[PDB]
Amino acid sequence: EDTYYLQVRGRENFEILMKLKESLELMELVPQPLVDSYRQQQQLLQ
Amino acid sequence: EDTYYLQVRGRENFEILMKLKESLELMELVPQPLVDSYRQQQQLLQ
Amino acid sequence: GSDLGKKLLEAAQTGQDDEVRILMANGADVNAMDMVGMTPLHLAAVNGHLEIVEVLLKTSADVNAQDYQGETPLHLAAIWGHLEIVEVLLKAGADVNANDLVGHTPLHLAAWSGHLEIVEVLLKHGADVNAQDKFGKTAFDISIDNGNEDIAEVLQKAA
Amino acid sequence: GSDLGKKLLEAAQTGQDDEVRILMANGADVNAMDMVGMTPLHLAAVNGHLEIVEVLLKTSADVNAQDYQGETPLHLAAIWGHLEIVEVLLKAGADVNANDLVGHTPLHLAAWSGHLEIVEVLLKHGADVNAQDKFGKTAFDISIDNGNEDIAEVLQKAA
Amino acid sequence: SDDELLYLPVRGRETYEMLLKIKESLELMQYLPQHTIETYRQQQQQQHQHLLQKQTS
Amino acid sequence: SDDELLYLPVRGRETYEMLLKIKESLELMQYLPQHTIETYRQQQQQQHQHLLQKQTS
């Protein structure tokens, strides 16, 4: 549906991108209220 | 040789990535001495 | 913060009951915080590990410990729908009306997730139905938004 | 910094001689700086626009203007191999021994690029062959590194 | 006891915002139950059934 | 007259470094002659001769 393929040179590069792919794909599963608490937290630290 | 293909959803997203593709591909053509001057400049501003 | 502290956070997260008991026996910090400020008790509540929650509640671990977002274990048991864990946190002295940074009570978060039995338990322990978040919204207002009609009507009956 | 200033930077960069003359007639700042601190004169030197360089050198524009990296128009004419531009900058009073932030002289940068005629011109105007960059390297040391044997031997003969 | 609080100096809005989206995604994973992770990871293992290849002709 | 000097606050080393590689690449383009740009851009126009497509079967 909205799946995207890419290609990367370098094992270290692939590993970083797999770490972030994971964390970015999982973000959709984080309840919005906890996201809102979190962004509140970041703004307070400014 | 070391050319890589990727796929992006969203015209605004494609435009940003084309801007950076340009600037990152052109970086190889910047003489190293001017790069070194530049990185010196950034360190001085710390 | 400490090696045993991180192992205990991870054992609590992953439901390693024997590991938890053994780390604690060896002096692991029960107030260890992960990168979002969660304690093993928070992580046991998130991941639904009732036995681990009961174990941690026999220690000095604060049942009302706040992570960096102001979430208590009761907020997170509530949002993830862990009814048994909600019940024992409340028995162990969980503040039913604890506020996170955007003014969510456990009731807001049970409302958000559509966890009916948990809304019922929170009301039973004196959840405040008239509490407003940062954005001026009650548990009710959020049940409405998220199309939780069961919970909408339970909340209106109580206000 | 100004609208005409940016247009003049871009006209100088892109070799739009008539545009340059017209922007200047209309009062465009000849000391306008781009995002790396380059003046129209810098950009005319980079891009090899001899006529535009000659035009700008009939104004108050500083022939020894430094960008944020300490590069003068003579550094950049040198590195990009614009012999005619090097010659007129030197005639217009370009400091042959100007230092950028990492201690490169125009001679270092002509050495780096393997521009033989330009090394010759820089020596002729009194380039200092014994000048060391941040990293302790002469024009000579850099000709060696970059396999510029012609220029290596010209530099050794002069030291 | 808390994780060490380090600070990252970032030149510019754009790099900052980008690093913020990244940090946010890495941190907020902590709030996910393992049932959710394990569901994700089985979804991912099943993507491997059909592997990526560069096509030709 | 100089470009406006803005500052971008960035939480963390990693986002900072990333935004720095980006900014650097965007700024240092200024040092390239148009002959070099035009060479690049003709190289790029010629990549279009052979267009990218998702292959099937």
Numbering used by the authors:
A (entry chain B), B (entry chain B): 352 to 397
C (entry chain C), D (entry chain C): 1 to 159
E (entry chain A), F (entry chain A): 357 to 413
Paper lines:
All members of the p53 family form tetramers in their active state through a dedicated oligomerization domain that structurally assembles as a dimer of dimers. Here we report the generation and characterization of Designed Ankyrin Repeat Proteins (DARPins) that bind with high affinity and selectivity to the p632/p732 hetero-tetramer. DARPins are small kDa proteins consisting of multiple stacked helical hairpin units in which certain positions can be randomized to select tight binders for a folded target domain.
In addition, we solved the X-ray crystal structure of the DARPin F11 also in complex with the wild-type p632/p732 hetero-tetramer. During the expression time of the p73 peak a strong pulldown signal using the DARPin A2 was detected that was not present at times in the absence of p73 expression, while a control DARPin did not show binding at any time point. These results also confirm that the mutations introduced in the ODs of p63 and p73 to stabilize the p632/p732 hetero-tetramer for the DARPin selection are not necessary for detecting the hetero-tetramer. A detailed structural analysis further revealed that both DARPins bound to the hinge region between the first and the second helix of both p63 and p73 ODs. Titration with the DARPins yielded dissociation constants of KD = 10 nM for DARPin F11 and KD = 17 nM for DARPin A2 and a 2:1 (DARPin : hetero-tetramer) stoichiometry, while a control DARPin did not bind at all. C Addition of DARPin F11 reduces the complexity with only the p632/p732 hetero-tetramer being strongly populated.
